[PDB]
Design a protein around this ligand. Sequence first.
Ligand SMILES: CCc1ccccc1-c1ccc(CNCCc2nc3cccc([N+](=O)O)c3[nH]2)cc1Cl
Ligand SMILES: CCc1ccccc1-c1ccc(CNCCc2nc3cccc([N+](=O)O)c3[nH]2)cc1Cl
Lengths: 327, 324
Amino acid sequence: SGPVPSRARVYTDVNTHRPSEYWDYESHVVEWGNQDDYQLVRKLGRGKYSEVFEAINITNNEKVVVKILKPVKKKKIKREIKILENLRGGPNIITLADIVKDPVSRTPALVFEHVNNTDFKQLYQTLTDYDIRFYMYEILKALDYCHSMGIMHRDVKPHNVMIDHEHRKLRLIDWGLAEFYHPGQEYNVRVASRYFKGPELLVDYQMYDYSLDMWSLGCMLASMIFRKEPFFHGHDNYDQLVRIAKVLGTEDLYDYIDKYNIELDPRFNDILGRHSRKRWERFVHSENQHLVSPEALDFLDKLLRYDHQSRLTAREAMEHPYFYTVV
Amino acid sequence: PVPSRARVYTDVNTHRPSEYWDYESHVVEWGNQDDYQLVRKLGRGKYSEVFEAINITNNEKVVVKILKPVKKKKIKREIKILENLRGGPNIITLADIVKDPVSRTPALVFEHVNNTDFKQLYQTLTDYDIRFYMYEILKALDYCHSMGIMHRDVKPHNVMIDHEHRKLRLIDWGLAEFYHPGQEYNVRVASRYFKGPELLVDYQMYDYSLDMWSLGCMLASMIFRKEPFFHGHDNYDQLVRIAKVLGTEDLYDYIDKYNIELDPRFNDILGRHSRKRWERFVHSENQHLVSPEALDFLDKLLRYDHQSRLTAREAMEHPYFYTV
Ligand SMILES: CCc1ccccc1-c1ccc(CNCCc2nc3cccc([N+](=O)O)c3[nH]2)cc1Cl
Ligand SMILES: CCc1ccccc1-c1ccc(CNCCc2nc3cccc([N+](=O)O)c3[nH]2)cc1Cl
């Protein structure tokens, strides 16, 4: 008969009850302004099909961020623009300020609010237990907001979280893989970055939801509190599930695939093996014990679960004792 | 023109960091309006509509103000001021800042207020009631002035009263601004009947004392049962109506003192007028609200010279309030 259907435990019908205007990005009309009002200063990063720059707005002498997009897929550009317009002004969401094209190149470009990114390489050596709790709570405010707006980010990872530590400011960026949640919809599993992909993507279960972002957030928490980067170090997408099974165990993996009647790809036959369920306390060492606590391990255990339905939602996560010390 | 500054809270914003008063640099976090269900329309103002609503997460009634985004800088200003004053005595409480997912229209969520009708209070009000509520307004004004803010739109429409619970709230901070000594402000503020002489003669270096003139106009209308007290038909005529009570002599002394150049539009309409005695406005229908203390207090608020008017602090110490 095929796989068993599934739906989100929260914000299930938020898009169903809204007019098509909100979610039908293919029908959205994009107004491209003149890029002559912005002067490019320096390159910040170079991603797949995009380059990010620091720039200056000549009309008010203010710094901005300009993302120049390689127009490989026009439908994908309309999707990112519509999502950014819908989320504009939301808590800890990057703020879209303008949509422009250079007069001669006609290359699509997005203009955002400036963020003064601190170099993290020196920062994780000085980070405290409070700092991790504080910034994890800021990420959860962004996730509960975008999920309430019927949007899944689908690429949560440290590269997509900008922090200005001096001002204690955090922003969730790069909404290029984000999508609108419709119950019963089958999505493409080729999303997120390898180390952050949820088990649903790795076993080809297409009827996933906001809970995918909660797995990716758990991977980030485990790498920070244990000082192990990345936490699940796969070398390919099949090996990535084996790395997860070496921690969570193979017994609970079979319960997951049986609950949803998922057919395991034959490529897992010779590599999966048999693995015991490990205790989270086994990852504690002298270099990371100052970031670990019973509360932190209980919270991590409630995020890193095979069953997407059993993971905490962003709102449930915000009520956990791990955050009792934050404002 | 001659430079002027406030007699109180002069440098309160000067000694605070830039974050406090630089509203243009303030980051506004717009939440999801899906947590609120609109019930009914309460009122419709210029560039705003006020609705009674219910917060679905705690089953509590709230007030939701939907703003027409005519000027984005003005929205940031009102929000920053409401955030700075949040929780202050008799100040409307900002509870949330939201936008509807499809319309993206800016909206402010406030505490609920069960207002008693203004046209209904007017008949059963006593001398004590006027003294009590005037003191409640003074608590809000001394607080916002101490916080370096001038309301600039003090009028009865902006004061909500729950008479059953004896609760008062100063609302509509859309025209409010931060006071900086020596700053020149826009004179196109406040409602016609409540505009101070400084606004009418185009004197831009005004302060917190503007709010004390407006409060004076409110007191005069209540004790004398004359609404409004100064009934101008346009901004130029408004100055003539004040001149009919305070006289044209003291107006020229005010003008000369600050080297104000009178607009030529006043040439054929201002005329010559005598200074009237406050006792002349007492009649059979209002004598139960008038007293020597009330007239002395009123005389100390309604003065052309903004520097000579009582401060909210000085006003709170007047014998008129000895019974509250
Ligand atoms: C490590 C995961 C984690 C777990 C728990 C709490 C915080 C974090 C975290 C969160 C964020 C960062 C800092 N990430 C910066 C990523 C970044 N910095 C940039 C700088 C310039 C451009 C960038 N771009 O993507 O275009 C860019 N992207 C560092 C860390 Cl340590
Ligand atoms: C006895 C106090 C007093 C002393 C001196 C002069 C006037 C009064 C007075 C007399 C009546 C009122 C009541 N004004 C209500 C105005 C109002 N009622 C509303 C009801 C609904 C919405 C409103 N809004 O503007 O958003 C709104 N605004 C307030 C006051 Cl302060």
